[PDB]
Design an enzyme around this catalytic site. Structure first.
Site, short mmCIF file in Angstrom:
data_model
loop_
_atom_site.label_atom_id
_atom_site.label_comp_id
_atom_site.label_asym_id
_atom_site.label_seq_id
_atom_site.Cartn_x
_atom_site.Cartn_y
_atom_site.Cartn_z
N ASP A 288 -91.50 -77.87 45.11
CA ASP A 288 -90.50 -77.87 46.17
C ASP A 288 -89.76 -76.55 46.10
O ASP A 288 -89.33 -76.13 45.02
CB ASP A 288 -89.53 -79.04 45.97
CG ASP A 288 -88.46 -79.11 47.04
OD1 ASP A 288 -88.81 -79.09 48.24
OD2 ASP A 288 -87.27 -79.19 46.68
N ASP A 290 -86.49 -74.46 47.20
CA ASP A 290 -85.12 -74.58 47.69
C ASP A 290 -84.42 -73.22 47.66
O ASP A 290 -83.51 -72.98 46.84
CB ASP A 290 -84.36 -75.62 46.84
CG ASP A 290 -82.93 -75.80 47.29
OD1 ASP A 290 -82.60 -75.44 48.45
OD2 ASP A 290 -82.13 -76.33 46.49
N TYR A 367 -76.46 -82.16 55.74
CA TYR A 367 -75.18 -82.49 55.13
C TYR A 367 -74.46 -81.19 54.80
O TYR A 367 -74.98 -80.11 55.06
CB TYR A 367 -75.36 -83.38 53.90
CG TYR A 367 -76.60 -83.12 53.07
CD1 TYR A 367 -76.78 -81.92 52.39
CD2 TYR A 367 -77.57 -84.12 52.93
CE1 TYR A 367 -77.90 -81.71 51.58
CE2 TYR A 367 -78.69 -83.92 52.13
CZ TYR A 367 -78.85 -82.72 51.46
OH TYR A 367 -79.95 -82.52 50.66
C1 LIG Z 1 -77.61 -75.56 38.30
C2 LIG Z 1 -76.12 -75.63 38.37
O1 LIG Z 1 -75.49 -74.61 38.58
N1 LIG Z 1 -75.48 -76.79 38.18
C3 LIG Z 1 -74.03 -76.88 38.25
C4 LIG Z 1 -73.62 -77.78 39.44
O2 LIG Z 1 -73.86 -77.21 40.66
C5 LIG Z 1 -74.52 -78.07 41.63
C6 LIG Z 1 -73.46 -78.86 42.53
O3 LIG Z 1 -72.52 -77.94 43.09
C7 LIG Z 1 -74.31 -79.61 43.59
N2 LIG Z 1 -73.43 -80.26 44.57
C8 LIG Z 1 -73.42 -81.57 44.81
C9 LIG Z 1 -72.63 -81.99 46.04
O4 LIG Z 1 -74.01 -82.40 44.08
C10 LIG Z 1 -75.22 -78.63 44.38
O5 LIG Z 1 -75.98 -79.38 45.26
C11 LIG Z 1 -76.54 -78.86 46.44
C12 LIG Z 1 -77.85 -78.28 46.16
O6 LIG Z 1 -78.00 -77.01 45.51
C13 LIG Z 1 -78.40 -78.02 47.54
N3 LIG Z 1 -79.84 -77.97 47.32
C14 LIG Z 1 -80.32 -79.22 47.73
N4 LIG Z 1 -81.58 -79.75 47.74
C15 LIG Z 1 -81.93 -80.84 48.60
C16 LIG Z 1 -82.61 -79.24 46.92
O7 LIG Z 1 -79.34 -80.03 48.22
C17 LIG Z 1 -78.09 -79.34 48.22
C18 LIG Z 1 -76.93 -79.97 47.43
C19 LIG Z 1 -75.81 -80.47 48.36
O8 LIG Z 1 -74.92 -79.28 48.67
O9 LIG Z 1 -76.09 -77.96 43.49
C20 LIG Z 1 -75.40 -77.17 42.51
C21 LIG Z 1 -76.51 -76.31 41.87
O10 LIG Z 1 -77.23 -75.53 42.86
O11 LIG Z 1 -72.19 -78.01 39.43
C22 LIG Z 1 -71.75 -78.64 38.18
C23 LIG Z 1 -70.29 -79.10 38.43
O12 LIG Z 1 -70.21 -79.97 39.57
C24 LIG Z 1 -72.07 -77.70 37.01
O13 LIG Z 1 -71.69 -78.33 35.80
C25 LIG Z 1 -73.58 -77.36 36.90
O14 LIG Z 1 -74.31 -78.51 36.51
#
Ligand SMILES: CC(=O)N[C@H]1[C@H](O[C@H]2[C@@H](O)[C@@H](NC(C)=O)[C@H](O[C@H]3[C@H](O)[C@H]4N=C(N(C)C)O[C@H]4[C@@H]3CO)O[C@@H]2CO)O[C@H](CO)[C@@H](O)[C@H]1O
EC number: 3.2.1.14
Length: 539
Positions: A288, A290, A367
């Protein structure tokens, strides 16, 4: 007369075709693929003739033979297929063969063939559904969710999904390549650790411990070869042969490397590492992509070019060619998917009508339409349609789908997204006609793990009572809770809005539904996804 009955000697019985260093921190030292496992067996004989020929049997099939020169002996041989075998030592002579009692030996392989099925009971409000609608039902599991969020692979309601995607495989690269990661405490450093001595632009595993070394249900033995998320995912595949498990490369914080792939040398290296990755981890069914936005506007304000659209199409074509090549070698079928922005502004930067020919599914991220990242212009974060107070709303699920259809994208490719989280603001004020979305915020609502974001589980648990106002906008097909006193506003998806999306999918003959991170749902969302798409209940 036949030889005496030999006794198998004490010794390790666990071997692996693909070896993993349970202590490694660098991906290059973490795994080594072999064409077969080197197995060893010893035996002793206290009563009777030792015979003239010794043989090792696996489930009754000869795997080794040699001269039986003594009352004791050792055999070294290879096993090129994973599994749990009933092993026996047989001593033979002119009058016949005499076999020892069986000893189980385990030959591990990354397809999970050595593991018993991981068939766990459904938890929380999850209810059983049969995947018989023919529609896609997917969700993303996050690698880092096994710590504080305490959500492991065994807690995934796997039977209720057709597709399960893995929480971001990163792309190696330090300064200038993965700068967006520096915003997360210790995250950039963790990647540098995993990528120690590895070329930039090749993929890796962000957290080797969580992925392969942390003890988890089903893979808890101190000497099990594959533990962590990967070990459980292998066992999951054994329990659900037809579930598509896909590694997702990128995400908001790991997309920076994609902007350099206009350079075919880097793109080729990336593609090559993906193939090697798939050859190494057999439980995965494809890949996949992204890329958080060809054209830019992602986490990094200094990246993005008008050339990204072409790079994206070229990448998908090459990945597809690489996967076809892989199919010719393994005879397996692989899927190629991509999660994309649902905004028309970004959608038109890519020729999906072309890229679609290399892809199995397009996961439309319908979203994050609104959120704490903007305190002036509020709205429904994941609505199906525009609200009544602003029918011209640009960011809606329908507009995203129409934008793709307009390009010429076939409807069956589009998988609509649902959110298992809500986005919210605080201090909302200056709104009129009792529509909180018309005002402005002073900051993000207090989140579950980060600001402005709340797990749906928490919304249903804490924000469905007390001072919280609840409203389901039937025009936009979106619910929201509001706490007048503090001005706290939360926009999310619920059973009903998801039902609207599912019906919408069936009506427009789209591909299905998928959700972002399964760990945040209490079951209401996934239950509705399945039901709305027509999957039967039962058990
Ligand atoms: C890898 C990393 O940096 N992890 C961080 C973490 O970041 C997350 C969150 O901010 C996610 N947000 C939510 C609402 O869960 C975020 O999600 C995104 C995602 O990247 C986008 N890509 C997709 N896909 C369908 C593949 O969907 C969206 C969602 C919805 O916006 O992703 C980031 C990483 O990219 O943040 C935590 C703290 O919250 C941190 O500890 C660490 O684990």
């Amino acid at each position: 007369a036949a030889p005496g009955k030999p006794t198998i000697a004490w010794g390790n019985t666990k071997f692996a075709i693909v070896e993993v260093d349970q202590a490694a921190t660098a991906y290059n030292n973490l795994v080594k693929v072999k064409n077969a496992a080197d197995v060893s067996v010893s035996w002793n004989l206290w009563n009777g003739d030792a015979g003239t020929t010794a043989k090792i049997l696996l489930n009754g099939k000869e795997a080794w033979s040699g001269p039986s020169t003594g009352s004791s002996g050792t055999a070294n041989f290879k096993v090129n297929k994973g599994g749990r075998y009933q092993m026996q030592v047989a001593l033979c002579n002119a009058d016949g063969c005499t076999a020892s009692d069986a000893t189980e030996i385990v030959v591990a392989d990354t397809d999970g063939s050595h593991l018993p099925p991981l068939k766990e009971s459904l938890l929380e409000k999850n209810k059983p559904y049969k995947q018989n609608s023919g529609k896609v039902v997917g969700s993303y599991f996050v690698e880092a969710g096994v710590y504080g969020r305490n959500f492991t692979v065994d807690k995934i309601p796997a039977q209720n999904l057709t597709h399960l995607l893995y929480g971001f495989i990163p792309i190696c690269g330090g300064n200038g390549i993965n700068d967006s990661l520096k915003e997360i405490e210790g995250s950039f450093q963790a990647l540098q650790r995993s990528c120690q001595g590895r070329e930039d632009f090749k993929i890796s595993i962000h957290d080797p411990f969580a992925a392969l070394q942390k003890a988890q249900k089903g893979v808890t033995a101190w000497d099990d070869p594959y533990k962590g998320n990967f070990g459980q995912l292998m066992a999951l595949k054994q329990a659900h042969p037809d579930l598509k498990i896909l590694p997702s490369i990128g995400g908001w914080t790991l997309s920076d490397p994609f902007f350099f792939m206009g350079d075919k040398v880097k793109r080729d290296r990336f593609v090559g590492s993906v193939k090697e990755f798939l050859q190494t981890w057999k439980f995965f069914d494809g890949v996949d992509i992204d890329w958080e936005f060809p054209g830019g506007k992602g986490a990094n304000p200094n990246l993005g070019s008008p050339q990204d659209g072409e790079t994206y199409v070229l990448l998908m074509k090459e990945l597809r060619a690489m996967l076809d090549q892989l199919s010719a070698e393994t005879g397996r079928k692989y899927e190629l998917t991509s999660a994309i922005s649902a905004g028309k502004d970004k959608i038109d930067k890519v020729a999906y009508n072309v890229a679609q020919n290399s892809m199995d599914h397009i996961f439309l991220m319908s979203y994050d339409f609104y959120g704490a990242f903007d305190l002036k212009n509020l709205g429904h974060q994941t609505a199906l349609n525009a609200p009544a107070w602003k029918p011209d709303t640009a960011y809606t699920t329908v507009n995203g789908v129409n934008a793709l259809l307009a390009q010429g994208v076939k409807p069956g490719k589009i998988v609509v997204g649902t959110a298992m989280y809500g986005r919210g603001w605080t201090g909302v004020n200056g709104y009129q006609n009792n529509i909180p979305f018309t005002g402005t915020a002073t900051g993000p609502v207090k989140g579950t793990w980060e600001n402005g974001i709340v797990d749906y589980r928490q919304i249903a648990s804490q924000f469905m009572s007390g001072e919280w106002q609840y409203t389901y906008d039937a025009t936009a097909e979106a619910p929201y809770v509001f706490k007048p006193s503090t001005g706290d506003l939360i926009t999310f998806d619920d059973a009903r809005s998801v039902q609207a999306k599912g019906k919408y999918v069936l009506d427009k003959q789209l591909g299905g539904l998928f959700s972002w991170e399964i760990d945040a749902d209490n079951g209401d969302i996934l239950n509705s996804m399945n039901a709305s798409l027509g999957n039967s209940a039962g058990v």
